[PDB]
From a paper:
To gain more information regarding the dynamics of the OMF tunnelling mechanism, we focused our interest on [name], the OMF protein associated with the MexEF complex within [name]. This efflux pump is implicated in the resistance to fluoroquinolones, the most used antibiotic class. As a representative member of the OMF family, [name] structure shows two main domains: a channel of 100 Å long located in the periplasm, also known as the α-domain, and a β-barrel of 30 Å long inserted in the outer membrane. The protein channel is closed by a lid of three β-turns at the extracellular side and occluded by a constriction of three a-coiled-coils at the periplasmic side, which gating mechanism is probably ruled by an iris-like movement.
Numbering used by the authors:
A (entry chain A), B (entry chain B): 1 to 445
C (entry chain C): 1 to 451
């Protein structure tokens, strides 16, 4: 008898994402070490350091150890608990029933105490089933944290490279705008120009120069996130983060069969294990509806005179079988069973919410990424056309055939176009991170 | 007797919102089913389905069931607790007081055990007062969750419509700009234009084209959000969410008396019930300064020989009145009572914080909504003037009385004004959501 | 004897912020009342009201009271627990090993019951040590809340002044825009202008006018945050928030020595205290490897007849010494010890995480502050050049020597540059707030002899 419900994993349908039978994706294989596809040795080294150094990941390993330990304690309860004891009871007073004289009472005991719950309705088995499930939930929390940390770290490296790239674009445009300002001064100083042109050229220059330390500020915050993610102090970063291009993936993304994502994601597995544990805890409570059968025991020495402890004349053994049942207090037991039942329903609903959220995340990740590819195509044209316009406009302002606002406006748009394209490239990179995060890549899978 | 403080609900003054005596608002009625004023049957359907499907709401129902179960367990402690038992003590050794010969010894017992706490100072009455209040707190948490879920979902629908409206504005402006690009080519080719016009028109068209998939991406995210809020997978959502106009409310908003808002909001009642519970708990702890009167009992059979259990010559009864009092351990009792007073002071301050947060949310929503109405008036005027500007610039550019930049800039401003007016209409719809969430609209009794 | 590990504070190296040996910072002093340097008596009153009224600070202080009361209860376990009792056992049945007759049975007891765990391996001393350290983690949680709340309140005052500043600038740019609209109309009606000029000037006015109620909305939301942070209802604010300038500190920033920052941060002390409690808890579990020794007792009266209770004839006493040891259940004691040790690893690891997060907030605050100063320099220039361009473009438009677009564009850049400058001024103010928050400003570390 192991009473209560026997847990079965819910019959959860595979994820279905149609968007993935398309050019951008390769369903034939899944890459577990998904970040290496960027081909960036600096990134690969950040990730390896993270996995040895991160303090959140280290808390999660410790919690996994703690959970195993809880389990190990509970598993002993299937066996008699045999402890040691030496005690005495000594006093003087009446002894009602026997005498109204005040007489000396002495008693000495030395030996083994035994306590055993016979697990006839599986109360104890259910407890262990529960702790086993909680131990596996802790393993899966640890794996999720790994998935989460790697995505966060790869993502922050993206933001660093982005700030760097945008800084480079700001300073490149700042030189075009300085050339323009210098031309407005030259034409003004040769008597064929205007202060108005110079003032507008100064203002635009100053706007562009203002963007530079803001972008450097962002890059620094990203260096500092990266250091914390690595388990390192900000000034102690080992890995060199001097600018390099934003990484890129050429090939179609190896995403495997999107219908395996719910099986691969550890957060799903962790919530499924919590549901398993909770379901076993209904069994624990269900056992209290039935009688409890216990078996106490003593083996050693009992004596009225302390001097005899240890001798054959004081040998003693005792056995204490006991059956308890709640009887008229079954109402209380039923209340606790309803408690355990409500908690298992909370756990199932919570499991289902995790599934739903996981499907929401992957549906977003794939929807975003398709759309971000399309957007980038339009941004690349915008940048090419902008540049060509700003070049033509600079020529014509020099030659006297267009007003300064034509060159100013064309310069503003070139900056705006180039910067927007960079941001869109960063988004694509981060969209890749989001896809692999939502698929549960990076724990070993 | 019932020791400790008698709980009284704090005398919290009514919310006062002076800005509600304006024209935007109707204080003569409150609509509970506040979203139905949008007259959007698709919205109505979404809300009804989320009330049966949402999984966070299912979790809260189950938490309520858990709390009622704790309360039911406590309620039985008012009465003698009567369990059943069959035990035996079997052994061989000395029997101190009686003999030093190692003898066989047997005791059998079978019957009913009684444990009764007389509760003369109302310790148990107070325990039940606390558990009852907490069941009510769990019921209020459930209702605050409905309020928050319905606001979240109405708001997401708004965002979905917003992105659909903005995609529509972007595509409409994309056509105007495509007509402009074709005009620059045509005039260039006919010999009265310039490559510099065409390049610039190419860049702006691409910029507008680029916005379209970003808007579409956002529409897809809001759709996936709605699906999870309904308790559905993204691909199972059957509700037809193809574009419709952003809903609007043309009559003054029925907001009722804003002095009722603190009584309506379930968050406030949940924090009030937690306060009532912690106050009962002070009662529990205060009761331990006084003696505890109890009464134990046995009714059944007691025998020296297993043979006799069940027979008349083994009938036994037993009664154990007991009075205990902490005496020199009152330091420990006083320490717990201080603990309980501190907890009740936390719960009081936390209730006041919730009140002040509710008034803040409420003050923001009204202040926001008034300003978003005024702001929209100016944006409507901006959009009108801009369309007329763009219209005229296009006539003037075709005719040869203005330069391409004038037309380019007027089209930029048209898009920018139109898009901004759209975002402001979306803000207004969300302003209405914020108002009703802040008044505690939309929960079931 | 006290068993298990003896806690030593980690040897945590000092923070090193190279960037702070610079002209913007004065490392010779630290002001713990860091907001007073803005020399803004309105702000100073907000802060004092907040400290009297804020409800979250009351919650945290009440949690600290409860933690100390818990610690006081655990402290009593080092001594005999002596309770009092009056009782009886009355019945009818057999009495095994005595008679098989159903006899009447009566018994009365009255006196003191005593229970004592003799704390020979320090189980109870370690419990008290854990519970004291958790007390301390609660004083420090409260102190970290106060640092956070002060920073949040000062930051919100800044946003409020920001929003008032930007509304002033929008309104001022609106007046220039209206003068320009008037001119497009005159030039039109005098046969030397264009309807297209009037139309674009109207679109621009409406755009600028649109921004005003949004800035007012922002300012209202800041007033309302301020009120909740003071423990006040939104319409009952006691401090007048009518527009004033965003405060400034011209003096170089008194930041002390950056290698003192980890000692000044209460969030660090809290996490360190939880690590100390958790290490004590290893001790608690270690003590269960060893025997437990107890002494029970009774002193009072025992009798078979009720009337005799209280008299000499019925005096009574007993003593009940005891020693147990887990023996064959040692594997359980060991599982719990492995568990306690795992929890201590977890705590050391959170303590270190908190240190790293504290160094990241500090690095970011100093980094941002420096960059924000540089940026403001360029934005001040933008504003100066834009204002002058717009003045000139107006002269030129009036002359018949530009399309209106030259003026319209110069007026947008003037508003856009001034507004950006005001935003950057707000961001510098908020950067100051982020520096002080990261350094653990806003509480008194020297109080209570530190510990
Ligand atoms: C009237 C005299 C009776 C004589 C009885 C002798 C009791 C011996 O006494 C016992 O001796 C043992 C070693 O032999 C010890 O281990 C015991 O602890 C001790 O109490
Ligand atoms: C077991 C014998 C019964 C002893 C009962 C003594 C009754 C105690 O009496 C109570 O003691 C408290 C002292 O802290 C006070 O707060 C109460 O006001 C007082 O009435
Ligand atoms: C660990 C021993 C606990 C001592 C109780 C101290 C009670 C008050 O604690 C004080 O609260 C203030 C805010 O209310 C903080 O500014 C102080 O730094 C803090 O010590
Ligand atoms: Cl982190
Ligand atoms: Na009960």
């Amino acid at each position: 008898c192991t009473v209560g419900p026997d847990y079965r994993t819910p019959d959860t349908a595979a994820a279905k994402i149609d968007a993935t039978a398309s050019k951008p994706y390769d369903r034939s294989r899944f890459e577990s070490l998904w970040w290496k596809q960027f081909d960036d040795p600096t990134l690969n080294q950040l990730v390896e350091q993270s996995l040895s150094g991160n303090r959140d990941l280290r808390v999660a390993f410790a919690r996994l150890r703690a959970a195993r330990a809880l389990r190990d304690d509970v598993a002993n309860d299937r066996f008699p608990v045999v402890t040691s004891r030496a005690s005495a009871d000594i006093g003087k007073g009446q002894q009602p029933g026997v005498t109204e004289d005040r007489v000396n009472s002495e008693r000495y005991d030395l030996g083994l105490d035994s306590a055993w719950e016979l697990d006839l309705f599986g109360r104890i088995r259910r407890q262990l089933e529960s702790s086993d499930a909680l131990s596996e939930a802790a393993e899966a929390d640890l794996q999720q944290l790994q998935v989460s940390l790697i995505a966060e770290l790869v993502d922050a490296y993206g933001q660093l490279r982005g700030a760097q790239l945008r800084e480079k674009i700001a300073l490149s445009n700042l030189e075009n705008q300085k050339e323009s300002r210098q031309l407005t001064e030259q034409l003004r100083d040769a008597g064929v120009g205007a202060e108005l042109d110079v003032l507008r050229a100064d203002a635009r220059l100053a706007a562009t120069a203002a963007s530079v330390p803001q972008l450097q500020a962002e890059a620094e915050r990203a260096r500092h996130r990266i250091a914390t993610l690595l388990g390192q102090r900000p000034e102690e970063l080992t890995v060199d983060l001097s600018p390099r291009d934003l990484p890129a993936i050429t090939k179609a993304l190896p995403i495997g069969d999107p219908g395996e994502l719910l099986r691969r994601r550890p957060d799903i597995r962790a919530a499924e294990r919590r549901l398993a544990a909770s379901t076993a805890d209904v069994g624990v409570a269900t056992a209290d509806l039935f009688p409890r059968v216990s078996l106490s025991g003593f083996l050693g020495f009992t004596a009225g005179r302390g001097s005899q402890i240890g001798s054959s004349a004081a040998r003693a053994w005792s056995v204490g079988p006991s059956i308890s049942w709640a009887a008229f207090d079954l109402g209380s037991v039923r209340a606790r069973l309803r408690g355990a039942k409500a908690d298992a329903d909370a756990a199932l609903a919570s499991y289902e919410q995790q599934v739903l959220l996981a499907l929401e995340e992957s549906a977003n990740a794939f929807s975003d990424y398709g759309k971000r590819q399309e957007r980038l195509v339009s941004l690349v044209r915008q940048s090419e056309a902008s540049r060509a316009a700003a070049q033509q406009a600079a020529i014509r302002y020099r030659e006297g055939t267009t007003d300064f606002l034509v060159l100013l406006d064309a310069e503003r748009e070139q900056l705006s176009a180039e910067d927007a394209q960079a941001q869109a490239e960063v988004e694509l990179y981060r969209g890749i991170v989001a896809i692999y995060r939502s698929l549960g890549g990076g724990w070993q899978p």
